[PDB]
RNA sequence: GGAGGGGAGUGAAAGAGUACCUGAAACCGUGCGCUUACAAUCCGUCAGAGCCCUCGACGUGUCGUGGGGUGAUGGCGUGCCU
RNA sequence: UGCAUCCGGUGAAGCCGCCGAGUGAUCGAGUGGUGGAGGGUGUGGGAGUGAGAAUGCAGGCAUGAGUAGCGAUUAGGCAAGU
RNA sequence: GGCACGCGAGCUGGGUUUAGAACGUCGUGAGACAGUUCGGUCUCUAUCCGCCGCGCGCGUCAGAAGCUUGAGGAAACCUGUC
Protein backbone atom coordinates (compact mmCIF):
# COMPACT_ATOMS: atom_id res chain seq x y z
CA UNK A 1 0.00 0.00 0.00
CA UNK A 2 1.00 3.64 -0.47
CA UNK A 3 1.38 6.33 2.20
CA UNK A 4 -1.37 8.92 2.09
CA UNK A 5 -2.94 11.92 3.80
CA UNK A 6 -6.48 13.28 3.73
CA UNK A 7 -8.36 16.54 4.15
CA UNK A 8 -12.05 17.31 4.57
CA UNK A 9 -14.20 20.38 3.98
CA UNK A 10 -17.51 19.98 5.79
CA UNK A 11 -20.60 22.16 5.37
CA UNK A 12 -19.36 23.66 2.11
CA UNK A 13 -22.23 25.84 0.89
CA UNK A 14 -22.52 24.28 -2.56
CA UNK A 15 -24.90 21.58 -3.74
CA UNK A 16 -23.48 18.07 -3.88
CA UNK A 17 -24.21 17.47 -7.57
CA UNK A 18 -22.62 20.75 -8.64
CA UNK A 19 -19.48 19.87 -6.67
CA UNK A 20 -19.45 16.38 -8.19
CA UNK A 21 -19.57 17.87 -11.68
CA UNK A 22 -16.27 19.63 -10.95
CA UNK A 23 -14.80 16.72 -8.98
CA UNK A 24 -15.27 14.21 -11.82
CA UNK A 25 -12.59 16.13 -13.76
CA UNK A 26 -9.70 15.49 -11.35
CA UNK A 27 -10.05 11.82 -10.46
CA UNK A 28 -6.76 9.94 -10.63
CA UNK A 29 -4.74 12.93 -11.79
CA UNK A 30 -1.68 14.26 -10.01
CA UNK A 31 -2.06 17.15 -7.59
CA UNK A 32 -0.47 19.79 -9.83
CA UNK A 33 -2.50 19.01 -12.96
CA UNK A 34 -5.70 18.78 -10.92
CA UNK A 35 -4.92 22.17 -9.36
CA UNK A 36 -4.39 23.76 -12.78
CA UNK A 37 -7.55 22.13 -14.16
CA UNK A 38 -9.59 23.51 -11.26
CA UNK A 39 -7.88 26.89 -11.62
CA UNK A 40 -8.97 27.15 -15.26
CA UNK A 41 -12.32 25.40 -14.79
CA UNK A 42 -15.24 27.76 -15.53
CA UNK A 43 -17.27 26.75 -12.46
CA UNK A 44 -17.76 28.45 -9.12
CA UNK A 45 -17.60 25.08 -7.35
CA UNK A 46 -13.95 24.64 -8.37
CA UNK A 47 -12.61 27.02 -5.71
CA UNK A 48 -13.66 24.91 -2.66
CA UNK A 49 -12.47 21.69 -4.31
CA UNK A 50 -9.12 23.27 -5.17
CA UNK A 51 -8.84 24.47 -1.58
CA UNK A 52 -9.49 20.95 -0.28
CA UNK A 53 -6.94 19.44 -2.67
CA UNK A 54 -4.32 22.03 -1.70
CA UNK A 55 -4.99 21.39 2.00
CA UNK A 56 -4.61 17.64 1.48
CA UNK A 57 -1.36 18.15 -0.43
CA UNK A 58 -0.01 20.40 2.33
CA UNK A 59 -1.02 17.84 4.97
CA UNK A 60 0.80 15.12 3.03
CA UNK A 61 3.92 17.25 2.56
CA UNK A 62 4.11 18.55 6.13
CA UNK A 63 2.77 16.03 8.64
CA UNK A 64 3.89 12.83 6.87
CA UNK A 65 6.87 14.49 5.17
CA UNK A 66 5.98 13.21 1.70
CA UNK A 67 7.42 14.67 -1.48
CA UNK A 68 4.75 16.82 -3.20
CA UNK A 69 6.10 15.85 -6.64
CA UNK A 70 4.78 12.28 -6.21
CA UNK A 71 1.31 13.17 -4.91
CA UNK A 72 -1.70 11.80 -6.79
CA UNK A 73 -5.40 12.46 -6.18
CA UNK A 74 -6.43 8.88 -5.40
CA UNK A 75 -9.88 9.19 -3.79
CA UNK A 76 -12.19 12.20 -3.96
CA UNK A 77 -15.96 12.52 -3.58
CA UNK A 78 -18.64 14.90 -2.32
CA UNK A 79 -21.44 13.87 0.05
CA UNK A 80 -24.57 15.69 1.19
CA UNK A 81 -24.61 18.04 4.15
CA UNK A 82 -27.51 19.49 6.12
CA UNK A 83 -30.03 21.44 4.05
CA UNK A 84 -32.06 24.41 5.26
CA UNK A 85 -35.64 25.06 4.16
CA UNK A 86 -36.86 28.42 2.85
CA UNK A 87 -40.17 29.65 1.43
CA UNK A 88 -40.73 31.44 -1.88
CA UNK A 89 -44.21 33.03 -2.00
CA UNK A 90 -45.94 32.51 -5.33
CA UNK A 91 -48.96 33.56 -7.38
CA UNK A 92 -52.46 33.32 -5.88
CA UNK A 93 -51.21 33.00 -2.32
CA UNK A 94 -49.41 29.65 -2.46
CA UNK A 95 -45.99 29.17 -0.87
CA UNK A 96 -43.30 26.91 -2.31
CA UNK A 97 -40.24 25.37 -0.69
CA UNK A 98 -36.61 26.29 -1.41
CA UNK A 99 -33.78 24.02 -0.28
CA UNK A 100 -30.39 25.56 0.53
CA UNK A 101 -28.16 22.50 0.28
CA UNK A 102 -24.59 22.08 1.54
CA UNK A 103 -21.99 19.36 1.04
CA UNK A 104 -18.89 17.70 2.46
CA UNK A 105 -15.85 17.19 0.22
CA UNK A 106 -13.29 14.49 1.03
CA UNK A 107 -9.92 14.17 -0.72
CA UNK A 108 -7.24 11.50 -0.23
CA UNK A 109 -3.87 12.11 -1.89
CA UNK A 110 -1.14 9.48 -1.88
CA UNK A 111 2.50 9.16 -2.90
CA UNK A 112 3.04 6.99 -5.97
CA UNK A 113 6.36 6.17 -7.64
CA UNK A 114 7.12 8.01 -10.94
CA UNK B 1 -19.19 49.41 -41.18
CA UNK B 2 -20.94 46.06 -41.45
CA UNK B 3 -24.04 46.04 -39.21
CA UNK B 4 -24.39 43.36 -36.56
CA UNK B 5 -25.95 40.18 -37.92
CA UNK B 6 -27.85 39.44 -34.71
CA UNK B 7 -29.49 41.54 -32.01
CA UNK B 8 -27.80 44.73 -30.91
CA UNK B 9 -25.25 44.99 -28.12
CA UNK B 10 -26.84 47.15 -25.43
CA UNK B 11 -30.36 45.84 -26.04
CA UNK B 12 -31.28 48.62 -28.48
CA UNK B 13 -29.80 50.31 -31.53
CA UNK B 14 -29.48 53.74 -29.90
CA UNK B 15 -27.87 52.25 -26.80
CA UNK B 16 -25.49 50.33 -29.06
CA UNK B 17 -24.49 53.52 -30.89
CA UNK B 18 -23.90 55.36 -27.61
CA UNK B 19 -21.97 52.36 -26.28
CA UNK B 20 -19.69 52.27 -29.33
CA UNK B 21 -19.10 56.02 -29.14
CA UNK B 22 -18.23 55.86 -25.43
CA UNK B 23 -15.96 52.84 -25.92
CA UNK B 24 -14.12 54.57 -28.77
CA UNK B 25 -13.74 57.70 -26.65
CA UNK B 26 -12.31 55.69 -23.75
CA UNK B 27 -9.96 53.78 -26.07
CA UNK B 28 -8.61 56.98 -27.62
CA UNK B 29 -8.30 58.72 -24.24
CA UNK B 30 -6.51 55.90 -22.39
CA UNK B 31 -4.89 53.80 -25.13
CA UNK B 32 -6.26 50.42 -24.02
CA UNK B 33 -9.54 49.32 -22.46
CA UNK B 34 -10.84 46.01 -21.13
CA UNK B 35 -14.34 44.87 -22.08
CA UNK B 36 -16.32 41.80 -23.10
CA UNK B 37 -14.97 40.13 -26.22
CA UNK B 38 -17.98 40.86 -28.51
CA UNK B 39 -17.84 44.53 -27.50
CA UNK B 40 -14.20 44.80 -28.61
CA UNK B 41 -14.97 42.77 -31.74
CA UNK B 42 -17.64 45.30 -32.70
CA UNK B 43 -15.47 48.22 -31.55
CA UNK B 44 -12.53 47.40 -33.84
CA UNK B 45 -13.97 48.65 -37.18
CA UNK B 46 -15.55 51.71 -35.55
CA UNK B 47 -12.32 52.89 -33.93
CA UNK B 48 -10.24 52.00 -36.99
CA UNK B 49 -12.50 54.04 -39.27
CA UNK B 50 -12.41 56.97 -36.84
CA UNK B 51 -8.60 56.74 -36.92
CA UNK B 52 -8.74 56.64 -40.72
CA UNK B 53 -10.77 59.85 -40.67
CA UNK B 54 -8.21 61.36 -38.28
CA UNK B 55 -5.33 60.36 -40.58
CA UNK B 56 -6.45 62.63 -43.43
CA UNK B 57 -6.75 65.64 -41.18
CA UNK B 58 -9.00 68.32 -42.63
CA UNK B 59 -11.86 70.41 -41.27
CA UNK B 60 -14.36 68.17 -43.07
CA UNK B 61 -12.86 65.07 -41.45
CA UNK B 62 -12.73 66.87 -38.10
CA UNK B 63 -16.47 67.54 -38.32
CA UNK B 64 -17.05 63.94 -39.40
CA UNK B 65 -15.22 62.69 -36.30
CA UNK B 66 -16.86 65.21 -33.96
CA UNK B 67 -20.30 64.09 -35.08
CA UNK B 68 -19.53 60.72 -33.41
CA UNK B 69 -17.01 61.37 -30.63
CA UNK B 70 -18.70 64.35 -28.89
CA UNK B 71 -15.64 64.77 -26.63
CA UNK B 72 -13.45 67.68 -27.68
CA UNK B 73 -10.28 66.83 -25.74
CA UNK B 74 -10.29 63.32 -27.22
CA UNK B 75 -10.85 64.83 -30.67
CA UNK B 76 -7.87 67.15 -30.20
CA UNK B 77 -5.64 64.27 -29.11
CA UNK B 78 -6.91 62.14 -32.00
CA UNK B 79 -6.08 64.82 -34.56
CA UNK B 80 -2.81 65.89 -32.89
CA UNK B 81 -0.97 62.66 -32.00
CA UNK B 82 -3.03 59.59 -32.94
CA UNK B 83 -3.59 60.91 -36.46
CA UNK B 84 -0.02 61.81 -37.40
CA UNK B 85 1.37 58.77 -35.56
CA UNK B 86 -0.32 56.32 -37.95
CA UNK B 87 0.51 58.38 -41.05
CA UNK B 88 2.52 55.67 -42.83
CA UNK B 89 0.50 52.63 -41.69
CA UNK B 90 -2.27 51.28 -43.94
CA UNK B 91 -4.86 49.72 -41.67
CA UNK B 92 -4.62 47.53 -38.62
CA UNK B 93 -4.40 50.36 -36.11
CA UNK B 94 -5.75 48.27 -33.21
CA UNK B 95 -5.32 44.76 -31.84
CA UNK B 96 -7.45 42.49 -29.65
CA UNK B 97 -6.04 40.34 -26.84
CA UNK B 98 -8.23 37.68 -25.24
CA UNK B 99 -7.94 37.56 -21.45
CA UNK B 100 -9.42 35.68 -18.51
CA UNK B 101 -13.19 35.42 -18.19
CA UNK B 102 -15.26 37.56 -15.84
CA UNK B 103 -16.05 36.14 -12.41
CA UNK B 104 -19.62 37.37 -11.97
CA UNK B 105 -21.12 36.01 -15.19
CA UNK B 106 -18.25 34.11 -16.91
CA UNK B 107 -18.31 36.62 -19.75
CA UNK B 108 -15.31 36.36 -22.11
CA UNK B 109 -13.22 39.46 -21.48
CA UNK B 110 -10.79 40.90 -24.01
CA UNK B 111 -8.38 43.83 -24.13
CA UNK B 112 -8.31 46.07 -27.21
CA UNK B 113 -5.38 48.44 -27.64
CA UNK B 114 -3.76 50.65 -30.26
CA UNK B 115 -0.55 49.39 -31.83
CA UNK B 116 2.57 51.35 -30.85
CA UNK B 117 5.26 49.27 -32.58
CA UNK B 118 6.37 51.74 -35.24
CA UNK C 1 -48.36 18.83 -19.07
CA UNK C 2 -47.48 16.99 -15.85
CA UNK C 3 -45.50 13.73 -15.52
CA UNK C 4 -47.88 10.79 -15.33
CA UNK C 5 -45.40 8.52 -13.53
CA UNK C 6 -42.33 8.62 -11.31
CA UNK C 7 -39.12 8.18 -13.28
CA UNK C 8 -37.22 5.01 -12.45
CA UNK C 9 -33.64 5.12 -11.20
CA UNK C 10 -32.18 3.85 -14.48
CA UNK C 11 -33.73 6.51 -16.73
CA UNK C 12 -33.04 9.30 -14.24
CA UNK C 13 -29.37 8.37 -13.88
CA UNK C 14 -28.92 7.80 -17.63
CA UNK C 15 -30.26 11.26 -18.50
CA UNK C 16 -28.50 12.88 -15.53
CA UNK C 17 -25.14 11.56 -16.74
CA UNK C 18 -25.26 13.96 -19.71
CA UNK C 19 -25.03 17.05 -17.46
CA UNK C 20 -21.26 17.36 -17.12
CA UNK C 21 -18.39 19.79 -17.59
CA UNK C 22 -15.57 19.35 -20.09
CA UNK C 23 -11.94 19.75 -19.04
CA UNK C 24 -10.30 22.74 -20.78
CA UNK C 25 -7.06 22.04 -22.61
CA UNK C 26 -3.93 23.55 -21.06
CA UNK C 27 -0.60 24.36 -22.66
CA UNK C 28 2.55 25.46 -20.90
CA UNK C 29 3.87 29.01 -20.78
CA UNK C 30 7.05 30.68 -19.53
CA UNK C 31 6.38 33.86 -17.54
CA UNK C 32 8.86 35.40 -15.08
CA UNK C 33 10.85 32.18 -15.49
CA UNK C 34 8.62 29.61 -13.81
CA UNK C 35 6.66 27.26 -16.06
CA UNK C 36 2.91 26.92 -15.57
CA UNK C 37 -0.20 25.78 -17.43
CA UNK C 38 -2.41 28.26 -19.29
CA UNK C 39 -5.19 27.61 -21.84
CA UNK C 40 -4.09 28.19 -25.41
CA UNK C 41 -6.79 30.86 -25.75
CA UNK C 42 -4.83 32.97 -23.23
CA UNK C 43 -1.32 32.20 -24.52
CA UNK C 44 -0.71 35.65 -26.02
CA UNK C 45 -2.27 37.42 -23.03
CA UNK C 46 -0.05 35.47 -20.63
CA UNK C 47 3.01 36.29 -22.73
CA UNK C 48 2.17 40.01 -22.50
CA UNK C 49 1.43 39.72 -18.77
CA UNK C 50 -2.29 40.52 -18.93
CA UNK C 51 -3.45 37.45 -16.96
CA UNK C 52 -3.19 37.24 -13.18
CA UNK C 53 -1.41 33.96 -12.40
CA UNK C 54 -1.48 32.93 -8.74
C1' G D 1 -9.55 35.15 4.17
C1' G D 2 -12.62 32.44 7.10
C1' A D 3 -15.43 27.98 7.47
C1' G D 4 -13.34 23.47 7.76
C1' G D 5 -9.44 20.06 8.28
C1' G D 6 -4.30 17.26 9.19
C1' G D 7 -0.69 16.58 12.90
C1' A D 8 0.04 17.35 18.54
C1' G D 9 -2.56 16.75 23.05
C1' U D 10 -7.04 15.77 27.24
C1' G D 11 -9.91 11.73 27.89
C1' A D 12 -11.05 4.71 29.53
C1' A D 13 -13.22 5.95 24.56
C1' A D 14 -12.91 12.10 19.97
C1' G D 15 -16.36 4.73 15.92
C1' A D 16 -17.93 11.08 22.98
C1' G D 17 -15.43 17.83 19.57
C1' U D 18 -20.29 22.10 22.74
C1' A D 19 -23.42 20.15 14.35
C1' C D 20 -21.70 16.19 20.60
C1' C D 21 -25.27 8.64 24.18
C1' U D 22 -27.06 4.59 21.04
C1' G D 23 -27.22 6.08 15.20
C1' A D 24 -32.16 2.17 11.73
C1' A D 25 -34.96 3.04 7.10
C1' A D 26 -35.94 6.27 3.04
C1' C D 27 -32.36 9.36 -0.05
C1' C D 28 -27.05 10.58 -2.12
C1' G D 29 -21.91 8.98 -3.08
C1' U D 30 -16.91 6.40 -3.66
C1' G D 31 -14.00 1.47 -4.72
C1' C D 32 -14.06 -3.60 -6.31
C1' G D 33 -16.40 -8.53 -8.93
C1' C D 34 -20.08 -10.13 -12.84
C1' U D 35 -23.17 -8.25 -16.79
C1' U D 36 -25.09 -4.85 -20.51
C1' A D 37 -25.06 -0.71 -27.10
C1' C D 38 -29.68 -6.41 -33.19
C1' A D 39 -32.74 -5.23 -28.53
C1' A D 40 -40.21 -5.38 -27.47
C1' U D 41 -38.51 -7.05 -20.45
C1' C D 42 -45.88 -6.68 -13.90
C1' C D 43 -38.97 -6.77 -14.42
C1' G D 44 -39.86 -12.34 -11.37
C1' U D 45 -39.71 -17.91 -11.36
C1' C D 46 -37.80 -22.80 -13.33
C1' A D 47 -33.61 -24.87 -16.32
C1' G D 48 -28.99 -22.68 -17.42
C1' A D 49 -23.34 -21.71 -20.58
C1' G D 50 -19.51 -18.43 -18.86
C1' C D 51 -16.62 -15.44 -15.16
C1' C D 52 -15.12 -14.34 -10.00
C1' C D 53 -14.94 -15.90 -4.59
C1' U D 54 -14.85 -19.61 -0.94
C1' C D 55 -14.85 -24.89 2.00
C1' G D 56 -12.42 -30.22 1.45
C1' A D 57 -9.71 -34.14 -1.02
C1' C D 58 -6.07 -35.60 -4.05
C1' G D 59 -0.88 -32.43 -7.20
C1' U D 60 1.17 -29.10 -10.09
C1' G D 61 -5.25 -28.61 -11.95
C1' U D 62 -9.58 -31.54 -11.10
C1' C D 63 -13.69 -33.19 -8.80
C1' G D 64 -17.33 -32.89 -4.62
C1' U D 65 -23.71 -35.82 -0.47
C1' G D 66 -20.16 -28.74 -1.66
C1' G D 67 -21.66 -23.32 -0.68
C1' G D 68 -21.93 -18.27 -2.62
C1' G D 69 -22.15 -13.41 -6.22
C1' U D 70 -23.35 -12.01 -11.32
C1' G D 71 -25.83 -14.14 -14.85
C1' A D 72 -25.75 -14.83 -21.90
C1' U D 73 -29.72 -18.05 -23.42
C1' G D 74 -34.69 -21.04 -23.40
C1' G D 75 -39.82 -22.19 -21.01
C1' C D 76 -43.71 -19.91 -18.06
C1' G D 77 -45.80 -15.54 -16.30
C1' U D 78 -52.25 -9.71 -17.04
C1' G D 79 -48.86 -5.38 -9.68
C1' C D 80 -51.48 -4.85 -4.57
C1' C D 81 -56.21 -3.20 -2.07
C1' U D 82 -61.52 -1.87 -2.01
C1' U E 1 -46.05 -7.35 36.34
C1' G E 2 -46.60 -11.81 41.35
C1' C E 3 -43.40 -15.98 42.35
C1' A E 4 -38.78 -19.20 41.41
C1' U E 5 -34.03 -19.36 39.16
C1' C E 6 -30.06 -17.73 35.54
C1' C E 7 -26.84 -13.94 32.76
C1' G E 8 -24.30 -8.97 32.81
C1' G E 9 -18.31 -3.11 32.62
C1' U E 10 -14.30 -10.50 32.00
C1' G E 11 -19.66 -6.04 28.50
C1' A E 12 -27.08 -6.23 28.81
C1' A E 13 -30.40 -3.93 25.56
C1' G E 14 -30.47 -1.78 20.65
C1' C E 15 -28.40 -1.92 15.55
C1' C E 16 -25.50 -4.23 11.27
C1' G E 17 -23.67 -9.39 9.30
C1' C E 18 -22.23 -14.79 8.95
C1' C E 19 -23.74 -19.74 9.76
C1' G E 20 -27.90 -22.34 10.50
C1' A E 21 -33.29 -24.10 12.47
C1' G E 22 -39.05 -24.82 12.65
C1' U E 23 -45.41 -27.18 9.51
C1' G E 24 -46.51 -20.89 10.33
C1' A E 25 -46.60 -16.55 12.72
C1' U E 26 -40.84 -16.93 13.61
C1' C E 27 -36.12 -18.74 16.41
C1' G E 28 -30.73 -19.19 17.71
C1' A E 29 -28.10 -19.30 26.66
C1' G E 30 -24.48 -20.14 17.92
C1' U E 31 -21.29 -16.72 16.75
C1' G E 32 -18.44 -11.58 14.30
C1' G E 33 -18.62 -5.98 14.50
C1' U E 34 -20.66 -1.50 16.99
C1' G E 35 -22.47 -0.17 21.69
C1' G E 36 -22.26 0.99 27.22
C1' A E 37 -26.40 -0.91 31.70
C1' G E 38 -29.73 -3.63 32.29
C1' G E 39 -31.80 -8.62 30.38
C1' G E 40 -33.25 -14.28 29.74
C1' U E 41 -36.00 -18.71 31.16
C1' G E 42 -40.54 -21.43 33.63
C1' U E 43 -45.21 -20.73 35.53
C1' G E 44 -49.35 -17.47 36.23
C1' G E 45 -51.88 -12.01 35.91
C1' G E 46 -53.08 -7.47 32.62
C1' A E 47 -52.89 -5.39 27.74
C1' G E 48 -52.58 1.69 24.75
C1' U E 49 -50.14 -6.23 21.96
C1' G E 50 -48.84 -6.95 15.67
C1' A E 51 -50.69 -1.63 9.55
C1' G E 52 -50.15 -1.87 3.26
C1' A E 53 -53.75 1.19 1.75
C1' A E 54 -58.68 5.38 5.53
C1' U E 55 -57.72 11.43 -1.57
C1' G E 56 -55.02 8.82 6.96
C1' C E 57 -51.39 12.50 10.64
C1' A E 58 -45.94 14.31 12.04
C1' G E 59 -40.86 14.30 10.54
C1' G E 60 -37.18 13.20 6.78
C1' C E 61 -36.26 12.57 1.44
C1' A E 62 -36.98 11.25 -3.74
C1' U E 63 -39.47 11.98 -9.67
C1' G E 64 -40.44 16.12 -12.54
C1' A E 65 -34.81 18.66 -12.61
C1' G E 66 -30.00 21.01 -12.30
C1' U E 67 -35.66 22.09 -15.52
C1' A E 68 -39.23 26.86 -15.11
C1' G E 69 -38.11 31.31 -13.00
C1' C E 70 -34.61 35.20 -11.00
C1' G E 71 -40.82 40.32 -10.48
C1' A E 72 -41.95 45.49 -16.21
C1' U E 73 -42.72 49.18 -19.97
C1' U E 74 -34.94 54.01 -18.42
C1' A E 75 -29.18 51.58 -20.34
C1' G E 76 -25.35 51.34 -18.97
C1' G E 77 -19.62 52.17 -20.27
C1' C E 78 -14.46 53.16 -19.14
C1' A E 79 -10.19 54.46 -15.74
C1' A E 80 -8.64 54.26 -10.76
C1' G E 81 -9.10 52.37 -5.51
C1' U E 82 -10.22 48.97 -1.66
C1' G F 1 -68.66 7.84 -46.84
C1' G F 2 -65.27 5.79 -42.35
C1' C F 3 -61.75 7.39 -38.54
C1' A F 4 -65.05 9.64 -30.17
C1' C F 5 -70.94 11.79 -36.57
C1' G F 6 -61.21 12.81 -36.95
C1' C F 7 -58.89 16.84 -35.07
C1' G F 8 -60.51 22.74 -28.29
C1' A F 9 -53.05 19.76 -22.98
C1' G F 10 -54.30 22.96 -31.67
C1' C F 11 -57.68 27.66 -32.16
C1' U F 12 -62.85 30.10 -32.12
C1' G F 13 -67.57 30.51 -28.47
C1' G F 14 -71.73 32.15 -33.26
C1' G F 15 -75.55 27.98 -31.21
C1' U F 16 -76.68 24.73 -27.02
C1' U F 17 -75.96 24.47 -21.46
C1' U F 18 -75.65 28.36 -14.83
C1' A F 19 -76.37 32.91 -12.30
C1' G F 20 -79.18 39.30 -14.87
C1' A F 21 -83.63 41.08 -17.78
C1' A F 22 -88.00 41.08 -21.09
C1' C F 23 -92.15 39.11 -24.32
C1' G F 24 -96.20 34.99 -25.24
C1' U F 25 -98.31 30.82 -22.55
C1' C F 26 -99.01 27.81 -17.95
C1' G F 27 -99.40 28.16 -12.22
C1' U F 28 -103.35 31.69 -6.83
C1' G F 29 -97.74 31.73 -5.54
C1' A F 30 -92.55 30.65 -5.27
C1' G F 31 -91.63 29.52 -10.42
C1' A F 32 -91.79 26.82 -15.38
C1' C F 33 -91.68 26.09 -21.03
C1' A F 34 -86.44 19.55 -26.12
C1' G F 35 -91.21 28.85 -27.07
C1' U F 36 -88.48 33.60 -28.38
C1' U F 37 -84.72 37.96 -27.55
C1' C F 38 -80.00 41.14 -25.42
C1' G F 39 -75.64 40.05 -22.30
C1' G F 40 -72.46 36.24 -20.22
C1' U F 41 -63.90 33.98 -17.36
C1' C F 42 -62.31 28.01 -22.74
C1' U F 43 -56.58 26.67 -17.09
C1' C F 44 -51.68 23.87 -17.73
C1' U F 45 -43.40 24.97 -17.62
C1' A F 46 -44.51 17.83 -22.11
C1' U F 47 -42.65 12.59 -17.81
C1' C F 48 -43.69 8.10 -21.43
C1' C F 49 -45.24 6.37 -26.24
C1' G F 50 -45.81 8.80 -31.20
C1' C F 51 -43.88 12.22 -35.11
C1' C F 52 -40.32 16.10 -37.35
C1' G F 53 -35.04 17.49 -37.23
C1' C F 54 -29.95 17.35 -34.94
C1' G F 55 -25.83 15.24 -32.11
C1' C F 56 -22.80 12.00 -28.65
C1' G F 57 -21.12 6.56 -27.85
C1' C F 58 -20.14 1.92 -29.72
C1' G F 59 -20.31 -1.61 -33.57
C1' U F 60 -19.05 -3.34 -38.87
C1' C F 61 -11.96 -8.51 -36.44
C1' A F 62 -5.48 -3.43 -37.37
C1' G F 63 -5.99 2.42 -37.63
C1' A F 64 -7.57 5.85 -41.38
C1' A F 65 -9.10 8.62 -46.10
C1' G F 66 -11.52 9.49 -51.06
C1' C F 67 -15.32 7.69 -54.60
C1' U F 68 -19.54 4.80 -54.65
C1' U F 69 -23.21 -0.07 -55.49
C1' G F 70 -27.50 -0.22 -53.96
C1' A F 71 -31.59 -4.36 -50.80
C1' G F 72 -35.32 -1.04 -48.98
C1' G F 73 -38.14 3.62 -48.60
C1' A F 74 -40.10 8.41 -49.77
C1' A F 75 -41.68 12.42 -53.23
C1' A F 76 -44.36 13.42 -57.91
C1' C F 77 -48.68 11.59 -61.04
C1' C F 78 -54.22 17.38 -62.46
C1' U F 79 -56.25 19.47 -66.75
C1' G F 80 -58.22 23.41 -70.53
C1' U F 81 -58.58 26.26 -75.16
C1' C F 82 -56.90 27.33 -79.90
Amino acid sequence: EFPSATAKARYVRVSATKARRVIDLVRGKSVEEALDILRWAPQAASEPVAKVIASAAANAQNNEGLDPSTLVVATVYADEGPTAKRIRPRAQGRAFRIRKRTSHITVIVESRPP
Amino acid sequence: PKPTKGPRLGGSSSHQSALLANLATSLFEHGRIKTTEPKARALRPYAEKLITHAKKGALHNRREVMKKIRDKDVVHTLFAEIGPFYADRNGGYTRIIKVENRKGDNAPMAVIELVREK
Amino acid sequence: AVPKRRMSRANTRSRRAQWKAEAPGLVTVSVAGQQRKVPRRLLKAARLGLVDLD
Side-chain angles (χ1 to χ4, degrees):
Chain A
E1 206 51 37
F2 299 131
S4 77
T6 184
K8 278 152 43 175
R10 318 223 303 142
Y11 316 108
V12 168
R13 204 149 273 98
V14 306
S15 88
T17 40
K18 268 143 180 183
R20 282 178 195 129
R21 165 159 79 140
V22 159
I23 278 180
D24 293 323
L25 295 177
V26 297
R27 278 230 183 74
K29 327 232 171 196
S30 93
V31 160
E32 59 83 12
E33 50 206 89
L35 283 195
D36 308 13
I37 286 277
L38 297 190
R39 153 88 186 88
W40 299 110
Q43 270 105 31
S46 41
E47 302 213 78
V49 182
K51 260 180 178 171
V52 187
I53 288 164
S55 180
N59 289 352
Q61 151 175 276
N62 190 350
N63 301 338
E64 291 66 353
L66 305 181
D67 163 12
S69 161
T70 58
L71 290 185
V72 160
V73 181
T75 290
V76 51
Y77 47 70
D79 314 272
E80 314 190 344
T83 175
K85 323 289 174 40
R86 306 295 181 231
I87 282 157
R88 174 80 54 206
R90 286 295 210 107
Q92 265 142 338
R94 40 193 133 191
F96 288 176
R97 181 85 79 71
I98 304 286
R99 295 139 193 105
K100 289 275 192 177
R101 307 166 181 282
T102 72
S103 47
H104 315 335
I105 290 145
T106 306
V107 171
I108 301 194
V109 297
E110 69 189 28
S111 290
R112 279 171 191 178
Chain B
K2 209 181 201 163
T4 75
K5 191 209 302 196
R8 298 326 174 254
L9 263 191
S12 45
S13 324
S14 44
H15 183 6
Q16 189 198 231
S17 181
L19 199 33
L20 294 182
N22 261 323
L23 283 172
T25 302
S26 281
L27 172 66
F28 296 143
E29 151 186 50
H30 293 118
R32 49 159 65 196
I33 63 175
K34 173 165 182 179
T35 171
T36 76
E37 184 185 359
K39 279 195 195 87
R41 286 274 158 75
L43 183 58
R44 271 195 48 199
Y46 193 91
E48 295 203 15
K49 280 186 170 173
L50 286 179
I51 292 156
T52 294
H53 260 299
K55 254 179 77 157
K56 36 189 174 167
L59 181 58
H60 188 60
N61 300 103
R62 189 154 194 143
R63 306 270 186 97
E64 283 303 293
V65 160
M66 273 182 357
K67 88 172 44 184
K68 298 228 188 164
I69 282 305
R70 184 135 55 134
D71 191 0
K72 285 191 155 192
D73 313 278
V74 175
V75 164
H76 156 69
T77 65
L78 185 65
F79 274 77
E81 32 258 52
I82 293 178
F85 180 64
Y86 292 120
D88 48 359
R89 176 183 298 254
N90 303 327
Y93 312 117
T94 68
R95 77 167 41 111
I96 284 195
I97 314 155
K98 303 169 292 292
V99 297
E100 206 190 359
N101 285 26
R102 203 146 70 175
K103 193 226 156 193
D105 48 3
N106 199 38
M109 281 295 208
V111 162
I112 165 167
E113 59 148 25
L114 311 163
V115 304
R116 262 103 163 73
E117 281 67 350
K118 261 189 180 174
Chain C
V2 316
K4 185 121 179 79
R5 226 149 263 122
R6 179 201 202 137
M7 281 266 268
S8 68
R9 312 172 46 89
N11 305 135
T12 287
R13 262 128 187 98
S14 73
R15 188 247 298 123
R16 185 169 290 160
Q18 296 279 4
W19 178 71
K20 79 199 129 174
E22 281 266 330
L26 307 183
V27 300
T28 177
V29 86
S30 34
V31 86
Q34 63 294 340
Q35 157 209 319
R36 54 181 41 260
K37 290 307 166 33
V38 161
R40 222 218 170 201
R41 181 196 131 98
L42 304 191
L43 198 46
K44 193 192 202 72
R47 268 206 276 286
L48 278 76
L50 277 174
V51 165
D52 263 8
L53 269 156
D54 301 332

